[PDB]
Swiss-Prot record, chains A, B, C:
This is Citrate lyase subunit beta-like protein. Binds 1 Mg(2+) ion per subunit. May play a role in fatty acid biosynthesis. It is an enzyme of class 4 (lyase). InterPro entries: Aldolase/citrate-lyase_domain, Citrate_lyase_beta/mcl1/mcl2, Pyrv/PenolPyrv_kinase-like_dom, Pyrv_kinase-like_dom_sf. Its cofactor is Mg(2+). GO terms for biological process: oxaloacetate metabolic process.
Amino acid sequence: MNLRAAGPGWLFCPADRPERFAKAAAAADVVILDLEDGVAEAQKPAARNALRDTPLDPERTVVRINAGGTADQARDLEALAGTAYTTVMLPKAESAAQVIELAPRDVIALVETARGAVCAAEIAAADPTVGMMWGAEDLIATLGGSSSRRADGAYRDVARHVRSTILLAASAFGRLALDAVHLDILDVEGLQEEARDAAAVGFDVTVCIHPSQIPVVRKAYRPSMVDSPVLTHAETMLR
Amino acid sequence: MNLRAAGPGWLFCPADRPERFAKAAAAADVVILDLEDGVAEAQKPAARNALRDTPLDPERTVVRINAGGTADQARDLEALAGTAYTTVMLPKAESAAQVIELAPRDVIALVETARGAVCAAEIAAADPTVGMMWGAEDLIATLGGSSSRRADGAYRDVARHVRSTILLAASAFGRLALDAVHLDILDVEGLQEEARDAAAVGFDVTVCIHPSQIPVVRKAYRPSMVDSPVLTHAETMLR
Amino acid sequence: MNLRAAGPGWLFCPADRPERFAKAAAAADVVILDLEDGVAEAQKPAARNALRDTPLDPERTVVRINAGGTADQARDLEALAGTAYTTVMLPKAESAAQVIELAPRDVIALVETARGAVCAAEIAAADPTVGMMWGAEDLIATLGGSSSRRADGAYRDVARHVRSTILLAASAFGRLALDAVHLDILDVEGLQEEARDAAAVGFDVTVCIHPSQIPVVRKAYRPSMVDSPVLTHAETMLR
Ligand SMILES: [Mg+2]
Ligand SMILES: [Mg+2]
Ligand SMILES: [Mg+2]
């Protein structure tokens, strides 16, 4: 896929909501049809049928499958066999081996556990990888913590650390870099601040969970002693 | 040991103060009997005798030995032979080899140097490791610096970086994660802030240097769009 | 070279300005004669001739060459053959191999790309390495970003992350640690804050781009429950 040619507004849509697929595609640059945490355990078989029955443009659609080693991932790959989709998102990505076993698909690795953070470079370097994303909430959950954000709304340090880790690992191997979802949908101010910062440090994408967030992300990724790299910054802004 | 079943308030007690061992055990969840920096060089032989003569519960007691390759560590392991203790804390932990040479003991690696930070994952993965701790002051000292904290009391960035490094490395290999001591004993407000943050990101323990800090830590580790990990956060709080 | 014995004020001087070499040497502790980004592409041959024609003290002078694999670096090493300089600075340093191929010269690796950050420990450990520096602007540029600093002037998180990475990697292998240039020359307050912090965490050097910054750096590297490392901090201050 030419995912880099699409804009920065990517949108999760649970795959057991086929009635919303067309609206998601209309709102977003890329749709992530979700078979993992956005779909209840009992609804995953229905989500797999909808995946086959209600196709979206495979050049602008990614499918988030279930974690490596799970029975659900096996059922997901069987369902995907009857689709035109070529790119999957791997949640709880924790090793190069988990990515490699998804070949010949293209893989966006979603790092959201301590093991994935420790192994981020190996995951990014794996041959099927085309992008890296991070997830603050599963990260904190699997660390045994209870909140990813400080009282003032900023991420706690370990989340900020993993965010930088994933940005560097993705960029070191020429992969797309995707920034974490902003869970507080009505907090447009906070999303605006995060997406502006993400654009400023070189993320390619901010992933959204609600279509109202897509215009905020698209606008944030547009701009408002000098050495050679500072001129590159100015040329990036013009672009 | 079932160190994870004990509470989060761990307390250093210098091993040349056997008159305080019982009070430390009464105040804390786990006692770290210290043969390293809490005991003056000339007092380490006396500390080793006290270690043998005044036993604490080996299921709730860790012994901090001296650094790898030192004559003091050799004397420590000889003294420990005449005790029931099974878990040691290794200061200036800098390689998997330093941990492995302490087998068959269980090892809590205290990372507090640049080399230890760079090798944190290898240290965490070593077979004897059961926990990781970090130390800001020895870290800054061995970097050649002069203070670990900013004017406003927050840790400087390299200390925050190592803290996250150790949390991730410990959690990636299922080890206990221990947060650094708060040296300003009377600064209860600052300890409260740090321990609340440590609990929120998934540290298991905040280590203390004064028994007055234990109630602050124990209280801080108790709690005051929703996806699956956010529900895990709420379940962790209830637990 | 005994670069560690020189003070902390290092100063870039473009090598096509030989009329300024003597003033740079008078102002700074160490001069970095620059064949890379400080010299326009068309002016690099003239800079190489000036490098040979206008010598500075090789015990207090480093030469920044061009990036590995470039034709310019090849021309730089040919020009350096007719000089007494023994230490080079490698920009966009990205692998141990790039450092090793500069043997038998001493190498200060300037890490300023995502790949260099991911490989910082391997770069620091390479046998020719004698120091590590980081560069925020090329880092942000090669990440595809557009600014290294927040609205309040602080570095964005990924720059802070790479700064700590380089400090730890340098110190883990006994290399000099050099902090990034402060591009806002007239912002003496901001330089003072950064250099004080750099000195406090154990950087050896803050690199400057204007001679007016050298006194600020030199002054900042002078100083204005207690365990063993806190006493080391106090002894470092007295020293
Ligand atoms: Mg998740
Ligand atoms: Mg220490
Ligand atoms: Mg540069």
